[PDB]
Amino acid sequence: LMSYINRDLENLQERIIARANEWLAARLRQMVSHLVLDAEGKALNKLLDESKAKGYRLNVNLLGEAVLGDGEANNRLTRTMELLKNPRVDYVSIKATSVVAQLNPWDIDGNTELLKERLRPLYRLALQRSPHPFINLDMEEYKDLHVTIRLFEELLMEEEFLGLEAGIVLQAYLPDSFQALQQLADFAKRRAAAGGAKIKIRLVKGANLSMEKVDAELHGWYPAPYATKEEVDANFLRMMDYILRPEHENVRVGIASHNLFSVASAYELSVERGVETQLDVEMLQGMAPAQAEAVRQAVGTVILYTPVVHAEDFDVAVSYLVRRLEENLTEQEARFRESVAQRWKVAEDSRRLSTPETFNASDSDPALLSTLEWARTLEDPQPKWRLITDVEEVDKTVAGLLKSPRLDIAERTALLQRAADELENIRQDLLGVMTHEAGKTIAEADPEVSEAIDFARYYARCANALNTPGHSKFTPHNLVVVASPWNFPVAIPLGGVFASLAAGAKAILKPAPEVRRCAEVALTALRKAGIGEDLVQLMHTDEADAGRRLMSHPDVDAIILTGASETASLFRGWKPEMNIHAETSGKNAIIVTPSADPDLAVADVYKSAFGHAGQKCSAASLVILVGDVGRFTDQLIDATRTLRVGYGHELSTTMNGLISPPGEKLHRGLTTLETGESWLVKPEKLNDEGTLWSPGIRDNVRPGSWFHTHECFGPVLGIMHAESLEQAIEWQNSTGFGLTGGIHSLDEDEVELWKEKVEVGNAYINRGITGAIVQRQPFGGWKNSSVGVGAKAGGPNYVAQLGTWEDIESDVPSVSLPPAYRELANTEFLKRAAALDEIAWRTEFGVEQDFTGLRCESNVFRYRPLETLYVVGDDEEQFNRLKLAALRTGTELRKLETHEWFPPHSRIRAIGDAPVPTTIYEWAALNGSVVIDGPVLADGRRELLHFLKEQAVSTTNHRFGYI
Ligand SMILES: Cc1cc2nc3c(=O)[nH]c(=O)nc-3n(C[C@H](O)[C@H](O)[C@H](O)COP(=O)(O)OP(=O)(O)OC[C@H]3O[C@@H](n4cnc5c(N)ncnc54)[C@H](O)[C@@H]3O)c2cc1C
């Protein structure tokens, strides 16, 4: 039972509506352009004099270049400090994210200390004048909420500042801002009791709804603001109601609204309750002058928002302002009546306290304080593990796994779903081991735990899709070996294990030696889930006889490998006929054309280059700029110098250390330049061991130079300067790799050309090229980035590789065929393959498929034609079956003999009854090609995969939220 509830608003309702009607009684870029003023020009001082004379005070707010680095952050602060030295200026307002760039959401304690350390000179400037001018802390995003309130309350209780009247914004569209108001109102009572001065809250409804909904939909969270504007109008009245009392004399209030009903309410409440000296009204300078003057005569104090800017930042600042001003009379009086009634009934908990039902597992939310609380208490688990060195133990363990009988699809599905539940329960144990043993930050390790959970649920669904009624039958492998790397030490090992189980096989997990405790901690979830030693076996083999015995073992049906392409050739050399599916790094670029948003491009380039210190198969190693990209390079430099280098287990780290000191390749990338190149930012070695390296940026990296064609797997980004988009696309395509790639451009024709011409498995448009989410962006590369037939992990065809398919007897439905195909189909078998190709093409291969259907991001799964297929053997009928497939995809068939050469990463189809000659297998193992040696299937749903390259195209759909 809450003593703040009352009926004053109900009683004043009609004098309020009369008041609003009374005040209302007495293209766009042109307007905002004439309202932004030079922070140093005379125009501003004239407007301060003229408005002071008319009885107004001005809220001076400094706009400018996006605050991506400490350089520009110092600019906003020092330049705001200069305005507070101007005696005509009464009121400045600034945001935490303008004072600290790249505000790390996981380090609230450190962010607070940094903000206080940086803002004290500014508040001192307000103490050196009497009367003291006013500093307001603005709020835009939900992540600003607790750090800013904490900044406000700690700073204003320091002895130095105890008597300074200062202010802070609450956004009423956040339900939990009602709780923030109550805590701030108590804080003001605690402060007054200590002899301190009042605080002031500026009440706003909220200007960031668009990006707040995007932030939610991307992560699988509820939006932080209310779902409807009625709730916002209601909470605006509730917060006003609560705070405009004599009980809270120490909290002055700025009502910031052009809604005359909202303002008339605060006016009438202040008069009825005798708290007129706590009510200022804050409005937009120049927007509604006739209204604001009516308001002034009633309320007294009216404070006009006045945007100012540094000269160069003018056109930049006008665009920021255009979005804010765009996105934000009897049916007006009725919507107000309703908000008066809902005032006390609207929610007050934070929408982020729980999560909507989504398919993808949702990440940890550092906007919740309960999240930041367990992030402080993470542990350093040290599970025991054993090294396998005896080949006879590999043999004993392998045969023991084969003896367990196959589980049926229901049992596998139940185990996988349980495995995903249990992984979630140890998310914090996984974070503990990943941030110590693997050296990852929380921001990098936490989505990886989500990926590991998603693999279990996704591949569970896929396993059911194997028995879908159709024209072929799947038979799983008995045993798959998963050889995993260290950079993603939970999701990649588990993803291969889950895929094997879903297919019907037993799995051996052999984890990379740097991250053996990661595998052990993850294994405890599988065990809790019911996945015992008869199903999955963890084998820490060496890389000598026992490891080789495991990878070459006659009873291992496939290896899933993530690592160096030299490792894939090594393994296959030991058994060239082996099934191997390998993801093997990439040399990935982001193209930035003059039509790009330079700031969004910089944020995506630097985050893609430097997450996990660049230790990603998908990392952005190259940025290729077309022509002149303006502020891009300066901002990229500022953002890169601002990354905090340190160990992953330190909350303040925003770029972690390396897994071990650089090898030859990476040390070269860090220390030495090639001809004509220069360091825009030169990497520095920051500790004796050589694991902590600051990031670097090479300029003038030329096509075919060493850094263009060698993945260093470290914190090094190279800039190439291209004369045209067409040339930049040539350069992006000639790295030897084809894993990830992105373009930044707001020009639709450039994007369409890029979507068609770029040769990468994972394409991204106007966003980062890392962070692939299961089913949203199925992950896998072309060219040297992949070994095998190559279905994408986290895509619908991956499980189906872990076995073999055969044609079955079935009745084909009636579907029409174009006559060119029927000319080729001169057999029972060939007619059956012609028809099934048509159906598969209609069902799957000819469709661009967005499985997740997000509003803010288009995520497309499509098939691209394989250009050339090599054919080994002689069999006219089967060769005609391949001509049918090639006529439909456009692929070129090339007949291939023994000892005839073929390029690296080729696909070679085996036809006929003869074995494939061994030399072809041996050569394929050296240059990473794949000999497809199963029977030729009539069912194109299976056979056509040999003629297609899977591809994910992910495109941002919104322009700062608008879609
Ligand atoms: C002087 C001044 C200072 C300001 N300072 C800030 C600041 O520091 N931080 C900040 O975030 N904004 C700030 N604002 C903007 C404020 O938050 C509003 O966006 C704006 O003033 C318009 O709202 P309203 O009360 O005029 O009119 P209205 O038409 O009454 O209110 C519009 C508001 O309703 C809300 N809304 C509309 N549709 C929906 C929906 N479908 N679901 C949920 N909510 C919805 C939005 O918050 C929207 O802004 C400031 C505004 C002024 C005038």
Q: CA-CA distances (angstroms) from residue 709 to 589, 612, 719, 731, 815? A: 11, 21, 13, 10, 48
Question: How far is residue 171's CA from residue 2's CA, in Å, rounded to a whole number?
Answer: 22
Q: Enter the DSSP assignment of 561.
A: E
- Reported as type and span, the H/E element at residue 420 is helix 409-425
Q: Does the beta carbon of 151 sit less than 6 angstroms from any atom of ligand 1? A: no
- Reported as type and span, the H/E element at residue 620 is strand 620-626
Q: Does the beta carbon of 265 sit less than 6 angstroms from any atom of ligand 1? A: no
Q: Chain centroid to CA 660: how far?
A: 26
Which atom of ligand 1 lies closest to the CA of 59? 1
Q: CA-CA distances (angstroms) from residue 773 to 219, 451, 452, 792, 849? A: 10, 7, 10, 12, 16
Q: CA-CA distances (angstroms) from residue 332 to 178, 237, 329? A: 24, 15, 5
β-pairing verdict for 579-583 and 762-765: unpaired
CA–centroid distance, 211 to ligand 1, in Å, is 14
Question: How far is residue 244's CA from residue 254's CA, in Å, rounded to a whole number?
Answer: 11
Handedness of CA 203, 207, 213, 219 (dihedral sign): negative
3-class secondary structure, 610:
helix
Structure tokens at 161: 């500042």
Q: Does the beta carbon of 916 sit less than 6 angstroms from any atom of ligand 1? A: no
Specify the residue with its C-alpha closest to ligand 1, atom 21. 257
**Cβ-contact 768, 608 below 8 angstroms:** yes
CB atoms within 10 A of CB 770: 26
Q: Enter the DSSP assignment of 363.
A: P
Q: Does the beta carbon of 262 sit less than 6 angstroms from any atom of ligand 1? A: yes
Q: Does the beta carbon of 161 sit less than 6 angstroms from any atom of ligand 1? A: no
Q: Does the beta carbon of 232 sit less than 6 angstroms from any atom of ligand 1? A: yes
Q: Chain centroid to CA 511: how far?
A: 26
Q: Does the beta carbon of 280 sit less than 6 angstroms from any atom of ligand 1? A: no
Resolution in A: 2.7
Q: In DSSP terms, which residues pair with 204 in a beta bridge?
A: 171
- 344-347 long-range contacts, CB within 8 A, separation 24+: 344/2, 344/5, 344/238, 345/234, 346/175, 346/226, 346/231, 346/234, 346/235, 346/238, 347/175, 347/226, 347/231
Q: Does the beta carbon of 61 sit less than 6 angstroms from any atom of ligand 1? A: no
Reading phi first (left if > 0) and then psi (alpha if -120 to 50, else beta), residue 793 is in beta
CB atoms within 10 A of CB 529: 21
Question: How far is residue 152's CA from residue 184's CA, in Å, rounded to a whole number?
Answer: 10
Q: Does the beta carbon of 258 sit less than 6 angstroms from any atom of ligand 1? A: yes
CA–centroid distance, 171 to ligand 1, in Å, is 8
Q: In DSSP terms, which residues pair with 622 in a beta bridge?
A: 589, 718
Buried b vs exposed e over 714-734: b needs ≥16 C-beta within 10 Å?
A: bbbbbbbebeebeebbebbbe
φ/ψ of 674, rounded to 5, equals -100, 170
What secondary structure, in 3-state letters, does 271-316 show?
HHHCCHHHEEEEEECCCCHHHHHHHHHHHCCEEEEEEEECHHHHHH
CA–centroid distance, 284 to ligand 1, in Å, is 11
Buried b vs exposed e over 195-228: b needs ≥16 C-beta within 10 Å?
A: ebbbbbbbbbbbbbbbbbbbbbbbbbbbbbbbee
Pocket mutation for ligand 1, best pick of 291, 321, 328, 346 (most atoms within 8 Å of C-beta): 328
CB atoms within 10 A of CB 40: 16
CA–centroid distance, 53 to ligand 1, in Å, is 28
For the chain, give the longest Cα–Cα distance: 99
β-pairing verdict for 696-699 and 678-681: antiparallel
Q: Does the beta carbon of 204 sit less than 6 angstroms from any atom of ligand 1? A: yes
Q: In DSSP terms, which residues pair with 307 in a beta bridge?
A: 61
Q: Give the residues after which the backbone of the chain is interrupted, taking a C-to-next-N distance over 2.5 angstroms as a break.
A: 26, 328
CA–centroid distance, 102 to ligand 1, in Å, is 25
CA–centroid distance, 57 to ligand 1, in Å, is 21
The residues near 646 (Cβ < 8 Å, ≥ 6 apart) are 652, 653, 655, 656, 657, 692
DSSP calls for 242-261: HHSSGGGTTEEEEEE---HH
Structural biology method used: X-ray
Residue entry with tokens 């959401």: 105
Structure tokens at 935: 């029977």
**Cβ-contact 638, 72 below 8 angstroms:** yes
The residues near 60 (Cβ < 8 Å, ≥ 6 apart) are 44, 83, 89, 91, 92, 93, 306, 308
Q: Does the beta carbon of 229 sit less than 6 angstroms from any atom of ligand 1? A: yes
Question: How far is residue 397's CA from residue 363's CA, in Å, rounded to a whole number?
Answer: 36
Nearest to 60 by CA among 96, 88, 99, 31: 88
Q: Does the beta carbon of 228 sit less than 6 angstroms from any atom of ligand 1? A: yes
Q: Does the beta carbon of 226 sit less than 6 angstroms from any atom of ligand 1? A: yes
Supply the angle between the helices 8-23 and 330-342 in degrees, to the nearest 10.
160
What secondary structure, in 3-state letters, does 856-918 show?
CEEEEEEEEECCEEEEECCCHHHHHHHHHHHHHHCCEEEECCCCCCCCCCCEEEECCCCCCCH
Buried b vs exposed e over 74-113: b needs ≥16 C-beta within 10 Å?
A: ebbbebbbebbebebbbbbbbbbbbbbbbbbbbbbeebbe
What helix, strand, coil percent values describe the chain, rounded to 5? 45, 20, 35
CA–centroid distance, 141 to ligand 1, in Å, is 13
